Amino acid sequence: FPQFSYSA
Amino acid sequence: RKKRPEDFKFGKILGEGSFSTVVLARELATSREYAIKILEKRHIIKENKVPYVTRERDVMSRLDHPFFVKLYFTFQDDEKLYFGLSYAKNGELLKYIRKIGSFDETCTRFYTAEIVSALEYLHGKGIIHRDLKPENILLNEDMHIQITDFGTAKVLNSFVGTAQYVSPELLTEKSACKSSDLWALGCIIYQLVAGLPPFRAGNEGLIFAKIIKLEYDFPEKFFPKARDLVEKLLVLDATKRLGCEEMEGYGPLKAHPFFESVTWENLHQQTPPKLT
Ligand SMILES: Nc1ncnc2c1ncn2[C@@H]1O[C@H](COP(=O)(O)OP(=O)(O)OP(=O)(O)O)[C@@H](O)[C@H]1O
Numbered sequence A: 001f002p003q004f005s006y007s008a
Numbered sequence B: 001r002k003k004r005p006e007d008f009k010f011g012k013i014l015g016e017g018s019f020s021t022v023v024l025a026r027e028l029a030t031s032r033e034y035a036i037k038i039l040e041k042r043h044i045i046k047e048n049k050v051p052y053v054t055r056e057r058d059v060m061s062r063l064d065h066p067f068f069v070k071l072y073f074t075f076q077d078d079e080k081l082y083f084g085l086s087y088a089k090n091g092e093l094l095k096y097i098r099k100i101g102s103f104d105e106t107c108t109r110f111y112t113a114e115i116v117s118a119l120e121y122l123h124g125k126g127i128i129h130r131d132l133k134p135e136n137i138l139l140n141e142d143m144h145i146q147i148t149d150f151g152t153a154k155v156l157n158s159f160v161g162t163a164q165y166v167s168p169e170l171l172t173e174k175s176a177c178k179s180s181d182l183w184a185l186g187c188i189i190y191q192l193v194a195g196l197p198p199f200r201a202g203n204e205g206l207i208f209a210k211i212i213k214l215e216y217d218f219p220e221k222f223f224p225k226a227r228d229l230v231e232k233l234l235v236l237d238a239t240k241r242l243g244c245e246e247m248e249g250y251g252p253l254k255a256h257p258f259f260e261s262v263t264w265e266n267l268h269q270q271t272p273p274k275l276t
Helices: B041-046 B050-061 B093-100 B105-124 B168-173 B178-194 B204-213 B224-231 B250-254 B264-269
Strands: B008-017 B020-027 B033-040 B071-076 B080-085 B137-139 B145-147
Touching: B008 B033, B033 B041, B041 B050, B041 B080, B050 B071, B050 B080, B093 B137, B105 B145, B105 B178, B105 B224, B105 B250, B105 B264, B168 B178, B168 B204, B178 B224
Parallel strands: none
Antiparallel strands: B008 B020, B020 B033, B033 B080, B071 B080, B137 B145
C-alpha cells in the first residue's frame, strides 16, 4: 500500500 | 516517525464492521488511548477498495474540529492497515435515543446545535458526509458528539446512504450535494424529539416512496420551534433547505429561533445537558 503510513 | 503495531498494547474490542476490527489501544511511550481501526489487506483487495480506503484516510486527515473523530496516524504491516482514531468512550447517539426514548427540548437543542456546528465545518471544507445518522454520531467521555464513518463521504455522485436518512435528490438524480446532509439533519432532529425517524415503512422501497412524496407527520407534542426548523430542512428542493448554499449557508440556520439561547463559540466547552 505504497505511501499509506501517516502521522499528525 | 511512522508508528508500528508493537508500539501499542491492544485491549478490548470496541466493535467490528463488515471488513474491520476496532480495538482500544494504549500507546506505550505516551500512555495515550486510541481506538485503532484495523483492516485486513486481503479483504480490501478482493473487493477493490484500495482507492476507497485512501479516500477515507484523506478525508479524515482534513478534519481537525472537536466534533469529528480525529485521525492521528495510519500505518501498516504484512496483513493489516491501521487507523489511529480518537476514542469515543460513550458510543453511538442511537444508543441514547433507544435508552431514553426521546430527548427533552434542552438536550435536543444542544445536540442539534453541535451537529449544525459540525456540518458548518465539514461543508466549509467542501465535503459531503452522505451517510449522516445517529449510528455515525459518536459521543466522547464528556458527552460531546464525534462524527465518524467517512468511507462514503464525497469531496467536491455515487449511490450511498441509509434508507431512513437518504435525501430525495439521491433517489431521483444519483447526485448528492451538501444540502443532502441537511435533509439527514432534518430527519435526525425529528428522531430526537419524536423518538423515531420521520419516514418509516415496512421495507426500503416504501420508505423511498414516502421521501419523494414528503409523506410524514408531526406528533402533537413536537416542540414548536423544533417543528418549524424541521419543516425548513425536510424540503424537497435541495436549494431551499435552510443552511444550504443557495440560502447563504450556515449563518441563517444558526440564527433560527430554535437556537436562540445557543452560544456557538463555546458549545464544545459547555457541559452537555444530562440525558434522562
Ligand atoms: N473512534 C471510535 N470510538 C469508539 N467506538 C468506535 C470508534 N470507531 C468505531 N467504533 C465502533 O466500532 C464499530 C465498527 O466500526 P467500523 O467503522 O469498523 O464499522 P461500521 O462503520 O460500524 O460498519 P462498516 O465497517 O460496515 O461501515 C461501530 O459500532 C463503532 O461504534
